Amino acid sequence: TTSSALKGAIQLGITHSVGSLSQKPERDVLMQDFEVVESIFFPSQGSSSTPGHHHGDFKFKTYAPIAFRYFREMFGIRPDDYLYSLCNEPLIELSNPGASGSLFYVSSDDEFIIKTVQHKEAEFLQTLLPGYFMNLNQNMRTLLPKFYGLYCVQADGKNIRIVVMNNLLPRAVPMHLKFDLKGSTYKRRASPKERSKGVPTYKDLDFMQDMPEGILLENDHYTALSRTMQRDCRVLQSFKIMDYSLLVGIHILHMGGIPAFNSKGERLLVFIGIIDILQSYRTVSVHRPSFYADRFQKFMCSTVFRK
Amino acid sequence: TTSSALKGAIQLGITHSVGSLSQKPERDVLMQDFEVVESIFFPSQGSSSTPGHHHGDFKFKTYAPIAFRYFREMFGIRPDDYLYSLCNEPLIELSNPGASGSLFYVSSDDEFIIKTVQHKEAEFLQTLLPGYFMNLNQNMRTLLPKFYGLYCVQADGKNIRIVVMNNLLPRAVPMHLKFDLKGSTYKRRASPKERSKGVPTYKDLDFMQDMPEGILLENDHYTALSRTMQRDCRVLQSFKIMDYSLLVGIHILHMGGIPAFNSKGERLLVFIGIIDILQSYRTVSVHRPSFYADRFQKFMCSTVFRK
Numbered sequence: 001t002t003s004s005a006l007k008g009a010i011q012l013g014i015t016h017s018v019g020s021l022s023q024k025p026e027r028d029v030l031m032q033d034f035e036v037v038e039s040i041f042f043p044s045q046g047s048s049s050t051p052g053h054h055h056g057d058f059k060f061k062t063y064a065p066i067a068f069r070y071f072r073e074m075f076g077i078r079p080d081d082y083l084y085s086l087c088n089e090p091l092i093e094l095s096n097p098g099a100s101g102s103l104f105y106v107s108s109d110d111e112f113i114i115k116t117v118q119h120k121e122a123e124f125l126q127t128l129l130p131g132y133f134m135n136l137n138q139n140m141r142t143l144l145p146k147f148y149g150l151y152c153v154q155a156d157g158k159n160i161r162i163v164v165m166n167n168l169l170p171r172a173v174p175m176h177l178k179f180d181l182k183g184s185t186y187k188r189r190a191s192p193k194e195r196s197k198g199v200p201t202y203k204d205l206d207f208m209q210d211m212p213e214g215i216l217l218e219n220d221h222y223t224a225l226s227r228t229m230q231r232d233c234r235v236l237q238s239f240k241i242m243d244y245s246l247l248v249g250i251h252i253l254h255m256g257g258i259p260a261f262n263s264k265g266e267r268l269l270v271f272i273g274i275i276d277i278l279q280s281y282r283t284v285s286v287h288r289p290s291f292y293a294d295r296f297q298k299f300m301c302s303t304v305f306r307k
Numbered sequence: 308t309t310s311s312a313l314k315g316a317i318q319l320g321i322t323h324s325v326g327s328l329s330q331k332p333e334r335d336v337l338m339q340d341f342e343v344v345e346s347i348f349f350p351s352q353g354s355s356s357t358p359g360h361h362h363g364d365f366k367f368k369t370y371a372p373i374a375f376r377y378f379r380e381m382f383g384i385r386p387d388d389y390l391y392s393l394c395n396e397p398l399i400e401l402s403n404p405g406a407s408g409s410l411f412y413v414s415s416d417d418e419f420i421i422k423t424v425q426h427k428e429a430e431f432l433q434t435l436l437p438g439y440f441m442n443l444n445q446n447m448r449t450l451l452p453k454f455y456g457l458y459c460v461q462a463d464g465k466n467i468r469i470v471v472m473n474n475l476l477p478r479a480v481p482m483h484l485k486f487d488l489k490g491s492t493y494k495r496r497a498s499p500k501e502r503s504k505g506v507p508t509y510k511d512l513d514f515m516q517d518m519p520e521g522i523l524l525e526n527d528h529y530t531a532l533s534r535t536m537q538r539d540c541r542v543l544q545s546f547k548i549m550d551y552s553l554l555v556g557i558h559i560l561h562m563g564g565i566p567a568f569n570s571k572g573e574r575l576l577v578f579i580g581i582i583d584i585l586q587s588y589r590t591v592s593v594h595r596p597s598f599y600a601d602r603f604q605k606f607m608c609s610t611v612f613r614k
């Protein structure tokens with residue numbers, strides 16, 4: 001089991017990483033804080049300020065600790081709630097629907113998602129942090145991932161790098177339709193394999209067909225979305241990012257999401273988040289990520305959400 | 308008159324610079340925005356979108372337009388209030404008490420101060436902008452300058468670079484004592500020349516003598532100050548900045564500042580701001596700006612303000 005040893009190191013390291021930070025007195029984030037990486041060592045034998053364990057010897061790299069303290073706080077994630085949910089209840093794997101070799105876990109209480117990430121991606125997240133902070137403090141209705149932490153586990157010379165972020169679609173509300181959307185069409189049909197799951201993640205072409213009348217929004221609700229998507233896309237292309245989806249969940253009826261109306265007339269509440277935003281191009285043209293973005297919203301704000 | 312031609316170019320350029328921005332639709336600030344410098348040309352002859360003038364031909368460089376739009380807004384400075392105060396009423400010079408060759412002006416309504424700045428200083432302000440934004444959005448009771456804009460006037464091959472910021476001590480409240488403070492002692496006595504002015508800017512040694520019992524603060528008011536000074540100094544040393552003063556004004560009685568009590572017992576309202584913060588050392592030791600900072604607050608929060 002390569003995994004049980006990964007789950008272990010994670011729950012171990014975060015606890016030490018975040019617990020040790022909670023004793024140090026809180027202070028503002030400085031630009032200097034974003035480039036910090038602190039490492040702490042974990043022998044199976046045990047250490048002065050380190051326990052021993054079933055799993056093999058590893059180091060636990062935690063990225064930009066202070067900034068994520070701030071981001072967590074700013075997202076209303078109480079520290080020992082973070083700690084309990086993540087480090088004190090069995091982590092749960094996930095048959096990754098990602099073509100990329102990245103693999104996901106969730107918290108037992110299903111509030112957090114952990115995803116693994118390319119070394120390129122993690123180093124880029126590290127550079128996003130200023131722009132992240134800036135967008136977070138200007139548009140608090142933003143749709144981007146909510147990054148709770150960035151950590152690296154290194155065992156036996158190999159790097160596993162992770163991003164703890166927010167589950168957009170929790171076990172809580174049952175969910176009748178899901179969509180991973182992009183505004184592109186090629187191979188945007190759920191693999192017959194995916195298609196037979198319980199609630200399958202339908203892609204674009206699936207959507208234009210099964211919901212051709214769309215998802216309807218009140219005049220007031222529609223502007224808000226249209227407004228902040230425009231805002232996020234301007235952020236995104238700024239950083240020359242691509243391949244990112246609008247993840248969309250719909251619950252039909254018979255309380256914290258977006259209220260909408262069906263083609264037939266059903267009152268339903270929608271749930272959205274922008275995901276897969278760490279693939280930057282900082283072989284693509286100068287104007288290219290701009291293209292991906294305009295297309296992106298010109299699709300969500302004309303075909304996927306209507307007034 | 309080298310000056311009338313400077314006052315002119317300033318009032319001219321800002322008007323064009325800021326007026327033209329007000330027609331362009333508002334949007335969030337991106338990291339990209341901080342490094343932008345837009346230039347616009349002013350012939351005495353006149354141009355397609357440019358008038359003619361008494362003064363000589365110049366270009367008007369305006370630094371980081373979008374960010375300062377944001378900073379102005381965030382400081383409650385309505386655009387045409389900025390414009391009127393600065394560009395539509397005679398600018399007023401000032402016998403600079405600065406040993407540095409920098410020279411000041413104020414607005415007729417005495418809400419804004421313009422100061423000229425070393426090319427080094429302006430280029431450093433340009434780099435402060437991210438850290439500035441970050442501190443501004445975390446500590447909105449911060450004592451640092453309120454930067455409204457950064458502009459450059461270039462005439463006859465020569466650079467004049469300016470920083471529009473906030474008058475800490477306006478014509479409005481009459482003011483009985485002023486202090487430029489640092490926590491250093493050498494030559495910190497008001498020059499006999501300065502000392503005979505109306506209300507002279509007393510320096511450190513002047514203070515420890517004329518007000519040896521200090522300035523007293525309620526338990527609640529004192530913590531607030533002590534708290535945010537600590538916060539600003541941590542910002543300041545972060546950027547390896549030095550030579551900055553706490554400017555302090557006191558009004559004794561017989562409504563927007565800090566309430567305090569005199570040695571005798573007089574109820575008085577204090578007015579403070581941290582100034583001269585663009586001299587960075589990014590010949591000084593690594594630990595040096597840290598030293599300047601600890602000394603700085605350990606003086607204001609023990610000798611200048613007492614609980």
Ligand SMILES: Nc1ncnc2c1ncn2[C@@H]1O[C@H](COP(=O)(O)OP(=O)(O)OP(=O)(O)O)[C@@H](O)[C@H]1O
Pocket residue numbers: 096097098099100101102103113165166167168169179180201245247273275276
């Ligand atoms: N924040 C999130 N909340 C809920 N589900 C998510 C989240 N992020 C990813 N998922 C699930 O994973 C799917 C896509 O993941 P993502 O695209 O981020 O990973 P990947 O392996 O990089 O995939 P891709 O191959 O498209 O790049 C989504 O359709 C969604 O079902």
Ligand SMILES: Nc1ncnc2c1ncn2[C@@H]1O[C@H](COP(=O)(O)OP(=O)(O)OP(=O)(O)O)[C@@H](O)[C@H]1O
Pocket residue numbers: 403404405406407408409410420472473474475476486487508552554580582583
């Ligand atoms: N924001 C402000 N509000 C009010 N007065 C100011 C402000 N900035 C500067 N002054 C006046 O100018 C004096 C010092 O200016 P400052 O130190 O910034 O300029 P300088 O020419 O760089 O001086 P120095 O030689 O000390 O570096 C202050 O004591 C104050 O009287």
Ligand SMILES: [Ca+2]
Pocket residue numbers: 243244245275276
């Ligand atoms: Ca994707």
Ligand SMILES: [Ca+2]
Pocket residue numbers: 100243276279
């Ligand atoms: Ca990906």
Ligand SMILES: [Ca+2]
Pocket residue numbers: 550551552582583
């Ligand atoms: Ca000074």
Ligand SMILES: [Ca+2]
Pocket residue numbers: 407550583586
């Ligand atoms: Ca100076």
